[PDB]
Design an enzyme around this catalytic site. Structure first.
Site, short mmCIF file in Angstrom:
data_model
loop_
_atom_site.label_atom_id
_atom_site.label_comp_id
_atom_site.label_asym_id
_atom_site.label_seq_id
_atom_site.Cartn_x
_atom_site.Cartn_y
_atom_site.Cartn_z
N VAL A 198 1.00 -1.42 -0.14
CA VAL A 198 0.99 -0.32 -1.15
C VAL A 198 2.43 0.12 -1.46
O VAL A 198 2.65 0.66 -2.56
CB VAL A 198 0.12 0.87 -0.70
CG1 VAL A 198 -1.35 0.49 -0.63
CG2 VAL A 198 0.58 1.48 0.61
N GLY B 4 9.01 1.99 3.16
CA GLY B 4 9.59 3.28 3.59
C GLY B 4 10.83 3.11 4.44
O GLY B 4 10.68 2.93 5.67
N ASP C 280 15.90 12.66 1.35
CA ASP C 280 15.43 11.55 0.48
C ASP C 280 14.23 12.02 -0.35
O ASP C 280 13.22 11.28 -0.40
CB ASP C 280 15.11 10.30 1.33
CG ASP C 280 15.09 9.01 0.53
OD1 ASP C 280 15.65 8.98 -0.58
OD2 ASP C 280 14.50 8.03 1.04
C1 LIG Z 1 5.26 4.50 0.92
C2 LIG Z 1 5.79 5.90 1.36
C3 LIG Z 1 7.16 6.22 0.69
N1 LIG Z 1 5.89 5.93 2.83
C4 LIG Z 1 7.01 5.66 3.54
N2 LIG Z 1 6.71 5.78 4.86
C5 LIG Z 1 5.45 6.11 4.98
C6 LIG Z 1 4.72 6.35 6.33
C7 LIG Z 1 3.45 5.83 6.56
C8 LIG Z 1 2.83 6.05 7.79
C9 LIG Z 1 3.48 6.79 8.78
F1 LIG Z 1 2.87 7.01 9.98
C10 LIG Z 1 4.75 7.30 8.55
C11 LIG Z 1 5.37 7.08 7.32
C12 LIG Z 1 4.92 6.21 3.72
C13 LIG Z 1 3.47 6.59 3.34
N3 LIG Z 1 2.81 6.05 2.29
C14 LIG Z 1 1.59 6.58 2.24
C15 LIG Z 1 0.56 6.19 1.15
O1 LIG Z 1 -0.56 6.58 1.20
N4 LIG Z 1 1.09 5.33 0.06
C16 LIG Z 1 0.34 4.82 -1.13
C17 LIG Z 1 -1.05 4.87 -1.26
C18 LIG Z 1 -1.67 4.35 -2.42
C19 LIG Z 1 -0.90 3.79 -3.45
N5 LIG Z 1 -1.56 3.25 -4.67
C20 LIG Z 1 -0.80 2.46 -5.63
C21 LIG Z 1 -1.65 1.78 -6.72
N6 LIG Z 1 -2.54 2.64 -7.34
C22 LIG Z 1 -2.02 3.36 -8.29
C23 LIG Z 1 -3.32 3.33 -6.44
C24 LIG Z 1 -2.49 4.10 -5.41
C25 LIG Z 1 0.50 3.75 -3.31
C26 LIG Z 1 1.11 4.26 -2.15
C27 LIG Z 1 1.49 7.49 3.26
N7 LIG Z 1 2.65 7.48 3.93
#
Ligand code: A1D8H
Ligand code: MG
EC number: 2.7.11.1
Length: 301
Positions: free
Chosen positions: A21, A24, A143
């Site tokens: 998806v 990070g 950030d």
């Molecule tokens: C990426 C983000 C900058 N990130 C950096 N690091 C961590 C992270 C993850 C887990 C941890 F324990 C700690 C940090 C994270 C993090 N993305 C999420 C998350 O839920 N991302 C997500 C979900 C769905 C989509 N779709 C795209 C296409 N369609 C339009 C439908 C939607 C896009 C992105 C939650 N956290």
């Protein structure tokens, strides 16, 4: 603040990686589904290297302490997959899945790559509520950008990625690390690249919020055309970026003006920006139908 990555359990027969998806700072973020329940979760996979070891410990502690807040994506726990001796192990960080994706993804899936003032106002306040919580606990995100502001199925705003975030001891404490995403980085942060005596604090997040508001308004941040290195030179010397169009309300222009004061000493704090008419006066905590419908149109196609 002592994490051991040895007593962490294997993720086998609990969570599985469905699709990629995003990413990070350090790691690739997947949509993870629980094997039994079918419960969705964001899972960041990264190699446990000696170079990024303390930076990963920093992230976990920060998530354990502060991620409970309603404007921060909630950290569930960690797993680790053991690669053979001598090789780096895969660390899994599990987290609340934000189903609608990032503010950047909403921008790209909106006519003219421009959001309504009423959505920008709603989101900006939810970010400020997240930042207010962090700043009260001597935390700087460092950030803040559309990519790191996510929306749930209910259109609840969530801050993510504490990979380059600073934990301060004192309230008046300061940082000097040249870090962040160039287009969104504050002048006092950019100063630290060449000037070794330059220091910054929480104020830098309120600049990045200012650029994130322009990002939502126009579709991309100022100086997005030119190279990041070509942008880092101009931000400190150029006058504060403004909205191209004047169709935007005088209160929204006033919010960007308040956020983007180049001198961090004159820049308003978090609690001051909350009292700004653009944040204070909104039609709130129930009426987010347009957003929930906007993301439902994306689900269909
Ligand atoms: C990426 C983000 C900058 N990130 C950096 N690091 C961590 C992270 C993850 C887990 C941890 F324990 C700690 C940090 C994270 C993090 N993305 C999420 C998350 O839920 N991302 C997500 C979900 C769905 C989509 N779709 C795209 C296409 N369609 C339009 C439908 C939607 C896009 C992105 C939650 N956290
Ligand atoms: Mg939370």
């Amino acid at each position: 603040d002592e994490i051991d990555l040895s007593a962490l359990r294997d993720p086998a027969g609990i969570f599985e990686l469905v699709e990629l998806v995003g990413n990070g700072t350090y790691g690739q973020v997947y949509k993870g589904r629980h094997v039994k329940t079918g419960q969705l979760a964001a899972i960041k996979v990264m190699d446990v290297t000696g170079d990024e070891e303390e930076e990963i410990k920093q992230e976990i502690n920060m998530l354990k302490k502060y991620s409970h807040h309603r404007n921060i994506a909630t950290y569930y726990g960690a797993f680790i997959k053991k690669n053979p001796p001598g090789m780096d192990d895969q660390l899994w960080l599990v987290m609340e899945f934000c189903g609608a994706g990032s503010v950047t993804d909403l921008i790209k899936n909106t006519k003219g790559n421009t959001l309504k003032e009423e959505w920008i106002a709603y989101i900006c306040r939810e970010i400020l509520r997240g930042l207010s919580h962090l700043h009260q606990h001597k935390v700087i995100h460092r950030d803040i950008k559309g990519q790191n502001v996510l929306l749930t199925e209910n259109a609840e705003v969530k801050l993510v990625d504490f990979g380059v975030s600073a934990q301060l001891d004192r309230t008046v404490g300061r940082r000097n690390t040249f870090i962040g995403t160039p287009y969104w980085m504050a002048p006092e942060v950019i100063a630290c690249d060449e000037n070794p005596d330059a220091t910054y604090d929480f104020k830098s997040d309120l600049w990045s919020l200012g650029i994130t508001a322009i990002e939502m308004a126009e579709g991309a941040p100022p100086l997005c055309d030119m190279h990041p290195m070509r942008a880092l030179f101009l931000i400190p010397r150029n006058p504060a970026p403004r909205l191209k169009s004047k169709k935007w309300s005088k209160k929204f222009q006033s919010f960007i003006e308040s956020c983007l004061v180049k001198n961090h000493s004159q820049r308003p704090a978090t609690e001051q920006l909350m009292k700004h008419p653009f944040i204070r006066d909104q039609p709130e905590r129930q009426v987010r139908i347009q957003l929930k419908d906007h993301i439902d149109r994306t689900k269909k196609k």
